[PDB]
Subunit: 269 residues, 3 copies
């Protein structure tokens, strides 16, 4: 594994929100995808452009307390302030006593832990979160990755009934990352596609007994992910994904997986 | 891979409820069990015998957009109308990219997507849902199958504290399909029995590390299944099943799995 | 497996309208005492209800007949001041004569009352009548220490909000947690700096176990799981939070610390 470096910035955005960006003026919600191989180290030069204390907390990856992103471990950042955070990762293997150490690989996420409360409640609602993917050697790589975040009642801090919509062509291998935040449980459902409830979202082969599902209950800070072959056995189309809690889907927690025919049309639009 | 047909009907029932049925005047809640082998195609000639728009959406199985049963896909049925829903399945197998294509096998369900709201909140509430089972070559087959739906605060739309109960004899292989609907998460618990948290609800052998459970958290549109040897290790008796959300069990989300001795008797109460 | 074991257990009132199980009169705790068995063991519990209300013992996961259900339905509760012997049994996994694999009993489980307040023990559970149960399979790795975290409604182990509990270890210790949930709410359990496999033992079997590896898990009333970590592994010593991740729940004090000490005893910096 490699040693990698990046810049990250925390910024306030024009409608009361907050975002992470790989450069000033280009903060997104969700924050930028961070992708690593088991074994890589990542040093993040972090800058808080905001006038409240901010920080960076990550799930799953190895980090010392000094990079925990919390007041407890004196790991937050002053308004306008600067901090270098270090995340490490490791491949799995047998310990000397026979036991198997798990591996860093998986779908994870990062978020603020100090805006509003000492658990980042205001930071998170306002949009200070994003995805982390860690790859194991030999993992299947996708053509695309879309991140879907159920934050309280909104997908990706979008107004009710505003997608996001996601585009692909028949036969593409599309990866989704699915993170939940806030107060509520939800239930993630995709029309016309299904996945394995295990680490990668795909069966290892014919001995993998994992449940095959198209609907999964998630809570605040759960993350998981999966890959599908777009259109596989179902064909082109506007395939809805949504929370399947009835009041939630009614109130617009819905969006589209736009699967285009080879030439580039969809039937019925 | 057999090609098969059934007829289905949506009809209003007593106390303003709605059910799918295999014949006019025999609609049930939950709907009739639909069972298929991986490879099978099912054509459902569906008649809406009601005064409102109605449809059929299935989870897990392969379907074209023209069969997603939603408004957007012009796939609902007009009052008194007729529509031909086609559900396909597939066996698992190797793709040319080296990857393992999952398979349709699973505990799944179907339900209205259009009554009440564009997400079928009204139809699901009234009882327009039933179970689907897609089996894999070699799967163990039950002596009976019983379907348990937590729909909001009701079980199978029964009044509080009124079942359903299910009867088996000791040593029966009994399969349960557990589906959840509506607004609320639940936790499904069975006294006296337990299952594996995986595709078939049974461990594939000693190297299957799946959690063995007797209680599982579910949310709206989650479906899972399992089989048990009735009263294995525990004996005959009235074995309660219920949601374990305390206010929920208190308010009525309780039923009985009545497990008789071979002479048909059951201890006590 | 397998031995016959016998204990005594008492249900008693505690201070602030609470109630608990204990191994001796006057020693009730919340959670109740950890019961640990090997697959194949039978345990006989000599249970005495010292309270003025009916109480029972009902267990998840293990083998019991209806006479040990702990319920009103099965005539299986205990009258005020009365005694009953409950029996729990366990079995190893095995091939059945129908060719299938019988699941074994081993795992992370719990017991609680089923009859205080309501016929579902809502008031008993509310007031502290619950405790952990662990069943081992031959060959299971044993830990240096076991800690029980119960999210009971909004409180952790019926402790007042923002009151821990905290658990201490040394870097390299093999530490077991048992995580149980009760009451009315869903929760999501999270631990900083550590992770586990979502499976029977919380540890992957080897390179081909595809179980999801997580540091966050949603749980509902009566769910129980467990896992073991090597404290500090890859992350070092530190004051490591665990908490519910439901934002309003963490904010309101559903939090505690896994205090992991260097081999020299220190936690930097503190
Ligand atoms: Cu966190
Ligand atoms: Cu935290
Ligand atoms: Cu939702
Ligand atoms: Cu977090
Ligand atoms: Cu749907
Ligand atoms: Cu839908
Ligand atoms: Cu419930
Ligand atoms: Cu659905
Ligand atoms: Cu019960
Ligand atoms: Cu909580
Ligand atoms: Cu219970």
């Amino acid at each position: 594994g490699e040693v990698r470096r990046i810049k990250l910035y925390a910024e306030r955005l024009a409608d009361g929100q907050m975002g992470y960006g790989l450069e000033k003026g280009r903060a997104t919600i969700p924050g930028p995808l961070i992708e690593l191989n088991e074994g890589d180290t990542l040093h993040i030069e972090f800058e808080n452009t905001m006038d409240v204390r901010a920080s960076l907390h990550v799930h799953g990856l190895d980090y010392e307390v000094s990079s925990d992103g919390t007041t407890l471990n004196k790991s937050d950042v002053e308004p306008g302030g600067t901090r270098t955070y270090t995340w490490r990762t490791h491949a799995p293997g047998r310990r000397s006593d026979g036991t198997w150490r798990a591996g860093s690989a998986g779908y994870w996420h990062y978020h603020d832990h100090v805006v509003g409360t000492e658990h980042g409640t205001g930071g998170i609602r306002k949009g200070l979160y994003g995805p982390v993917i860690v790859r194991r050697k030999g993992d299947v790589l996708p053509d695309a990755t879309h991140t879907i975040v159920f934050n309280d009642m909104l997908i990706n801090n979008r107004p009710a009934h505003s997608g996001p919509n996601f585009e692909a062509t028949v036969g593409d291998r599309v990866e989704f990352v699915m993170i939940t935040h806030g107060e509520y449980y939800h239930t993630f459902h995709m029309h016309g596609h299904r996945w394995a409830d295990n680490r990668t979202g795909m069966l290892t082969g014919p001995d993998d007994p994992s449940q095959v599902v198209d609907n999964k209950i998630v809570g605040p800070a759960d993350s998981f992910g999966f890959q599908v072959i777009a259109g596989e056995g179902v064909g082109a189309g506007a395939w809805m994904y949504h929370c399947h809690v009835q009041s939630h889907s009614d109130m617009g927690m819905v969006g589209l997986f736009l699967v285009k025919k080879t030439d580039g049309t969809i039937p019925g639009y």
